[PDB]
């Protein structure tokens, strides 16, 4: 059973402090490992496109999910980023400048795409959404 002594406040505080580490959410935000991850605790990161890659969809689906290999400028790390929307991979080229955001699940894969935790938001300073709707045009240079 719990300790209940009126003079046992120290033990209760220490026990809670020790047991907090069993909590995964608490440990994630108190171990200081977010700075060694590709984004280093940022909502977005810019990078250079290295190569277009197709990723097979997970069972029971069957598709080729279009993604890009991006090297982050600020630390040189390499990640896989999904390119959403139909035919939007055609707006991406090798050595292009892309803005990368999270996939929405805080560092975890989404949907039937395996091992992909990022998506492309902008290419060459123009949002992919504008390119898909023809609102803007990708800069020639």
Partner RNA sequence: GAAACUGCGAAUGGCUCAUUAAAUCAGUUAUAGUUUGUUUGAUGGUAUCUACUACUCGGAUAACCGUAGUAAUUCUAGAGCU
Partner RNA sequence: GUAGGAUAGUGGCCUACCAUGGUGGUGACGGGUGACGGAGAAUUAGGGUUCGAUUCCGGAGAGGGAGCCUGAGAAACGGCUA
Partner RNA sequence: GUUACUUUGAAGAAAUUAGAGUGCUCAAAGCAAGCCUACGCUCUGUAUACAUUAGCAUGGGAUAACAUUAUAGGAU
Partner RNA sequence: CCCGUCGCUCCUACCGAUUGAAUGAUCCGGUGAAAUGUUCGGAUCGCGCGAGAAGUCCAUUGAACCUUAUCAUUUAGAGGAAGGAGAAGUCGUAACAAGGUUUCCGUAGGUGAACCUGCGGAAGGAUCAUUG
Q: Is 78 in the site for RNA (CB under 7 A)?
A: yes
Which positions from 18 to 47 touch RNA by CB under 7 A, shown as an x/- string? Answer: --------------x--xx---x-------
| Stretch near K ion under the rule CB under 5 A, chosen from 43-51, 53-61, 91-99, 122-130 | 53-61
Distance CA 116, CA 58 (A): 12
Q: Which does 9 bind (CB under 5 to 8 A by kind): other proteins, RNA, K ion, none?
A: other proteins
Q: Two tokens at 84?
A: 């959403």
Residue 137 in contact with residue 126, Cβ under 8 Å? yes
**Residue spans of beta strands (DSSP E) within the chain:** 44-56, 64-72, 78-82, 97-102, 118-123, 126-127
Determine, following the binding rule CB under 8 A, whether residue 64 of this chain makes contact with other proteins: no
For residue 125, the minimal CB distance to RNA (Å) is 27
CB atoms within 10 A of CB 24: 8
Quick check: 1 binds other proteins (CB under 8 A)? no
Those residues with Cβ within 8 angstroms of residue 115's Cβ, 6 or more apart along the chain or in another chain:
55, 80, 109
Applying CB under 7 A, the residues found at the interface with RNA are 10, 32, 35-36, 40, 56, 58-59, 62, 78, 80, 114-115
Write out the residues near K ion by the rule CB under 5 A. 59-62
């Amino acid at each position: 059973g719990k300790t209940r002594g009126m003079g046992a406040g120290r033990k209760l505080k220490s026990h809670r402090r020790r047991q907090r580490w069993a909590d995964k959410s608490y440990k994630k935000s108190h171990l200081g490992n977010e700075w060694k991850k590709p984004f280093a605790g940022s909502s977005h990161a810019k990078g250079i496109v290295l190569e277009k890659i197709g990723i097979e969809a997970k069972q029971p689906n069957s598709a080729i999910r279009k993604c890009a290999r991006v090297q982050l400028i600020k630390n040189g790390k390499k990640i896989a980023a999904f390119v959403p929307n139909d035919g939007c991979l055609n707006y991406i080229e090798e050595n292009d400048e892309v803005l990368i955001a999270g996939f929405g699940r805080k560092g975890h894969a989404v949907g039937d795409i395996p091992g992909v935790r990022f998506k492309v938001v902008k290419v060459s300073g123009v949002s992919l959404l504008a390119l898909f709707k023809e609102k803007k045009e990708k800069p020639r240079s």
